[PDB]
Amino acid sequence: KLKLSDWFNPFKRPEVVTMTKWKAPVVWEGTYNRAVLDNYYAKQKITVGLTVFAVGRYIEHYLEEFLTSANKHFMVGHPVIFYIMVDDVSRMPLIELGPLRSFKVFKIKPEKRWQDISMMRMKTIGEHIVAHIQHEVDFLFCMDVDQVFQDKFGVETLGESVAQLQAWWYKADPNDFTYERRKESAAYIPFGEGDFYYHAAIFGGTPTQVLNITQECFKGILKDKKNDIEAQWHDESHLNKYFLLNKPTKILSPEYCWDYHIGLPADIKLVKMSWQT
């Protein structure tokens, strides 16, 4: 019993793309009513999970800043569980969590190549969804550790499957997209096809949707492997493949995952989350 016109007003931003050929909204600053959604979701006692991985140097360079900013800005006012995957828990920074946040740490086996660390996430996440995340949360987000929340990343971001507009190509055209183009990759996207180029630093949805995203992506990662090939942008190419065959129900503007090295365009009203230094 919740409708688009209840919380979303596109006309608040006519200059940017707020809707998709498939009726899915694209959230931009000013286009949303958190207050109504906060109220709507709190009634439902909704709870949101956030998985984040950090093996090796990334642990001391980013984990703490990630957790600290998430604590302060992610789904504030709703129960959230942080799922922390590390290779060495003794190096795990323990920050002080605030109201409605709790966490769980897990020790994972550290892959030799970072590219595989990043890709093996697809398999791990899936294992954890089937094991417990499926039963602990209503919505799940999977993020990259080397990020930082800047402002409120709220419930205006929930949906059945949520993708992130890659900051450097949302304004671009599809054939410029660095999709995988080698028909030998499961991640292959013809030169005619493609809707957008999604950032893999942030994807989410319901546990069931996320389990499907992650399963399909790992199968792709494995198919490509038995074929002695590696998608150019690894898991992100597979995700883009996936999000093409299965359009996302919600897409988030680059304002949610902004690269300040792109400066500060006029079409990015307020930055919720930026890439790390």
Ligand X SMILES: O=c1ccn([C@@H]2O[C@H](COP(=O)(O)OP(=O)(O)O[C@H]3O[C@H](CO)[C@H](O)[C@H](O)[C@H]3O)[C@@H](O)[C@H]2O)c(=O)[nH]1
Please give the residue ranges that form the binding site for ligand X (CB under 6 A). Answer: 53-58, 114, 117-118, 144-146, 199-201, 233-236
To ligand X, the closest distance from the beta carbon of 233 in angstroms equals 5
> Mask of contacts with Hg ion, 85-124, x by CB under 5 A?
-----------------------------x----------
Look up tokens 């999709």; give the residue: 179
H or E segment to which residue 161 belongs: strand 161-165
Nearer to ligand X, 32 or 62 (CB): 62
Nearer to ligand X, 18 or 255 (CB): 255
Cα separation, 161 vs 142, whole angstroms: 11
The entry of Mn ion, Hg ion, ligand GAL, none that residue 144 binds, CB within 5 to 8 Å by partner kind:
Mn ion
Angle subtended at Cα 60 by Cα 234 and Cα 111, rounded to the nearest 5 degrees? 35
Any bridge partners for residue 147, and if so which? 275
Residue 214 has a CB neighbour count (10 Å cut-off) of 25
Task: Print the SS3 string covering 70-114.
Answer: HHHHECCCCCEEEEEEECCHHHCCCCCCCCCEEEEEEECCCCCCH
Residue 55 labelled as part of a binding site: yes
Asked whether position 275 contacts Hg ion by CB under 5 A, the answer is no
The entry of Mn ion, ligand X, ligand GAL, none that residue 145 binds, CB within 5 to 8 Å by partner kind:
ligand X
Interface residues toward ligand GAL, by CB under 6 A? 166, 168, 178, 199-201, 233, 236
Residues that bind Hg ion (CB under 5 A): 114
Residues catalogued as catalytic: 236
